[PDB]
Write an enzyme that holds these catalytic residues in place. Structure first.
Site, PDB file in Angstrom:
ATOM      1  CG  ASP A   1      -3.701  -2.963   2.487  1.00 48.78           C
ATOM      2  OD1 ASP A   1      -4.708  -3.306   3.140  1.00 48.78           O
ATOM      3  OD2 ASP A   1      -3.755  -2.160   1.533  1.00 48.78           O
TER       4      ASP A   1
ATOM      5  CD  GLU B   1      -2.804   1.347   0.159  1.00 51.95           C
ATOM      6  OE1 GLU B   1      -3.636   0.442  -0.057  1.00 51.95           O
ATOM      7  OE2 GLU B   1      -2.697   2.363  -0.565  1.00 51.95           O
TER       8      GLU B   1
ATOM      9  N   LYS C   1     -15.236  -7.825   2.493  1.00 53.28           N
ATOM     10  CA  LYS C   1     -13.850  -7.839   2.030  1.00 53.28           C
ATOM     11  C   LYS C   1     -13.392  -9.245   1.662  1.00 53.28           C
TER      12      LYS C   1
END
Ligand SMILES: O=C(NCCOc1ccccc1)c1nc([C@@H]2CCCN2C(=O)CSc2ccccc2Cl)[nH]c(=O)c1O
Ligand SMILES: [Mn+2]
Ligand SMILES: [Mn+2]
Length: 180
Positions: free
Chosen positions: A93, A65, A119
Site C-alpha cells: 500500500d 494503493e 495477511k
C-alpha cells in the site's frame, strides 16, 4: 438494484475515494452496485491509506494503493531498483522512505491477530511491513513498530469508529461485520 449501503458509501466518503474504489473494483471485475460491502471496505481501506500517508513528514511515504495495477507495479519496481529493497510478491500500500520498507495496511472487523496471521502467511514476503487497524480501536504492526506517532494513529482509529457508528445507525453494520 440500489442498496442502502451503496448510497451510504457515496455520502460518507469523498468523491475522489469513491471514484478510486469504483475503478479498483471494475479493474478486478466486480461491481459496486451489487458487492456493496466490498465497496464500503475498499473505500475505508483507501481512506486509511491516505490518512496514514498524511501522518509522516512532507514526502515520507510513496502511495502505491489507489493506482492502476500497472503503474503501481511500475513505482514498486522504481522503488526497488533505487533502494535495493526486495520486490514484494504482492502489491503493498505504501513505501516508507524513512524506514526503507513497504507497508501493507489492513482494516479488519475480526480480531487484529486473526487477520494479521492471514495477511502475513499470504504475503510471505518477510520484508513487507504490516500494520493492521480494527474497527474497535485496536491495532497491530510487525515487530511492534507502528511507524507513525500515536496522534496520527489515533485519528485513524477515531475515523474507523465513526464509520462503524454511521453504519450501525443505518442498520448496515451487522451485514457489514458478517461479510468479511
Ligand atoms: O491491495 C489489495 N488488493 C489488491 C486489489 O484487490 C482487489 C480485489 C477485489 C476488488 C478490488 C480490489 C489488498 N487486498 C486485501 C484483501 C486480501 C487480498 C485481496 N483482498 C481483498 O479483496 C479484500 S477487499 C480490498 C481490496 C483492495 C484494497 C483493500 C481491500 Cl480491504 N487487503 C488489503 O489490505 C489490500 O491492500
Ligand atoms: Mn493494497
Ligand atoms: Mn492493504
Amino acid at each position: 438494484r440500489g442498496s442502502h449501503m451503496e448510497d451510504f458509501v457515496r455520502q460518507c466518503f469523498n468523491p475522489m475515494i469513491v471514484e478510486l474504489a469504483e475503478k479498483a473494483m471494475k479493474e478486478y471485475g466486480e461491481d459496486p452496485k451489487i458487492e456493496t460491502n466490498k465497496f464500503a471496505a475498499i473505500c475505508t481501506h483507501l481512506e486509511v491509506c491516505f490518512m496514514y500517508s498524511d501522518g509522516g513528514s512532507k514526502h515520507r511515504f510513496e502511495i502505491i494503493e489507489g493506482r492502476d495495477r500497472i503503474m503501481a507495479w511500475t513505482v514498486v519496481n522504481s522503488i526497488c531498483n533505487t533502494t535495493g529493497v526486495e520486490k514484494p510478491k504482492f502489491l503493498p500500500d505504501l513505501y516508507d522512505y524513512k524506514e526503507n520498507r513497504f507497508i501493507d495496511i489492513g482494516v479488519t472487523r475480526r480480531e487484529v491477530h486473526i487477520y494479521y496471521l492471514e495477511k502475513a502467511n499470504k504475503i510471505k514476503s518477510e520484508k513487507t511491513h504490516i500494520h493492521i487497524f480494527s474497527f474497535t480501536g485496536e491495532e497491530m504492526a510487525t515487530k511492534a513498530d507502528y511507524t507513525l506517532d500515536e496522534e496520527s494513529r489515533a485519528r485513524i482509529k477515531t475515523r474507523l469508529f465513526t464509520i462503524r457508528q454511521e453504519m450501525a445507525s443505518r442498520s448496515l453494520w451487522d451485514s457489514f461485520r458478517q461479510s468479511e
